[PDB]
Amino acid sequence: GIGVMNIMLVSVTERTREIGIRMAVGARASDVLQQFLIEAVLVCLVGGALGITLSLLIA
Amino acid sequence: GIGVMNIMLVSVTERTREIGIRMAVGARASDVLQQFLIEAVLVCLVGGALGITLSLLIAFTLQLFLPGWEIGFSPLALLLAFLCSTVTGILFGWLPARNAARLDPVDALARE
Amino acid sequence: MTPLLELKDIRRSYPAGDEQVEVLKGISLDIYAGEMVAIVGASGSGKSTLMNILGCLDKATSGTYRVAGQDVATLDADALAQLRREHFGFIFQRYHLLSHLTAEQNVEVPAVYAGLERKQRLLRAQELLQRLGLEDRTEYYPAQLSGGQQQRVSIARALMNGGQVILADEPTGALDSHSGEEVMAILHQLRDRGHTVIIVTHDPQVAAQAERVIEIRDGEIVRNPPGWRQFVSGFNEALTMAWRALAANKMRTLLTMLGIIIGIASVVSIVVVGDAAKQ
């Protein structure tokens, strides 16, 4: 799961100008960490749902 | 190791215009698959070298704990691990760079 | 009366050779409502950086730039952003917007930081779009949109804040004088709406449109001739934003999620099976 961090890092790295337009509309510095981390853990949870699903399939 | 394929896919995706300038200098469609897959398996092998290195570090680490438990090198397993890193490397890097080989220089350049 | 802005002797300076350079020097400026001020001057004069003062991007550590009589030096930068929602509605030549969002969303964004019901401000945004004369374009990606319309989206985006103060990077320079000066006429409408607006340009010609050119050089003007609610709304709205960001890379998302899935599925797998044989 660790490389997912690298993935998100890349994604945000792509978002650099998007980061700028978001700060441009007065986003709090916390807010990007908010949305991004929430998206990441979101992926973790949906992958956890499909994951447990497949695990039950194995069951 | 599978996500490394995703990583390389991203990297090549970034290289799109670079892909176009490389096709612009008359590169064979095979050649991109060549260099990219070679770089990927390269990462697999250097990571296999540092990996086996750390594994040996763990080995001496277990020499440090000897309740009669004994270390024993298995070089055939070492080389099998190497070849395994290799085949996983080609396994991951093959398809995306194949899709890269599919690509036209035209779209790889004119696109903005 | 007292001008809503008071830039007196404010100046920035930034390090080079481990010493700050004269990007700016002490300048006296005052601004009323409804102003349509040009920022004529040499490129790289820091008049852009001066606009960054106007954007309150950084404290100048000099002078007292009294926004509505309140100096920038006192307020939090986050409070400055609160001022931005309270006032500022910036617009650029490059019409920067998410490729992700539909234009309605691209206008939707600034008020997201405000605490407000989505549907209401969506209706307001639709009003802003009809103000742009745009309606059919609402669902389109900006890439699907013509650039002048995209700039219109930047305008409505400014408008959702009420557009009380508006900086403007090269409003017409990205495109034709037709739609360009047209949008400039809309700027005249907002001037008629009485909101303060301030274009920036090194070009006198487009500056002719403005009611108040001001030229700066060598760091000084050579002349002046006239809530947890958004956290949960963050949860669901950025849930949608997440779905869109994944839409940007469904395949990468696939490999990623699969990397998760095989992992956890294997977790519960080996745990349960080993536990069972153990039983």
Find residue C21's DSSP bridge partners: C14
Determine the Cα–Cα distance for residues A6 and B32; give it in Å rounded to an integer.
24
Q: Do A47 and C256 touch (CB under 8 A)?
A: yes
C165 membership: H or E segment, kind and range: strand C165-169
Minimum distance, in Å, between the CA of residue A3 and any CA atom of chain B: 7
B67 touching chain C per CB within 8 A? no
Residue B2 corresponds to which tokens in the numbers above?
Answer: 């599978």
Tell me how many degrees the CA angle C68-C69-C73 measures, rounded to the nearest 5.
Answer: 100
Residue A52 tokens read as 């447990």
Resolution (A): 5.3
HSE-CB at C198 with a 13 A cutoff on CA atoms is: 25
Helix axes B75-102, B3-14, angle to 10 degrees: 40
Distance in angstroms (rounded) separating the CA atoms of residues B5 and C255:
9
B68 contact A CB<8A: no
Task: Assess contact for C168 and C91: CB atoms under 8 A.
Answer: yes
CA distances from C277 to B76, C56, C269, C274 (A): 33, 66, 12, 5
Query: What distances in angstroms separate CA C216 from CA A55, C13, C57, C147, C235, one per listed residue?
Result: 68, 15, 19, 30, 46
Burial of residue C212 (number of CB atoms within 10 Å: 0-12, 13-18, 19+) = middle
Domains by residue range for chain C, with CATH? 5-235 (3.40.50.300)
- Mutation target vs A (from B4, B5, B6, B43; most A CBs, 10 A cutoff): B6
Beta-carbon separation of C255 and B6 below 8 A:
yes
Q: Residue type at B28?
A: R
CB of B99 within 8 Å of a chain C CB? The answer is no
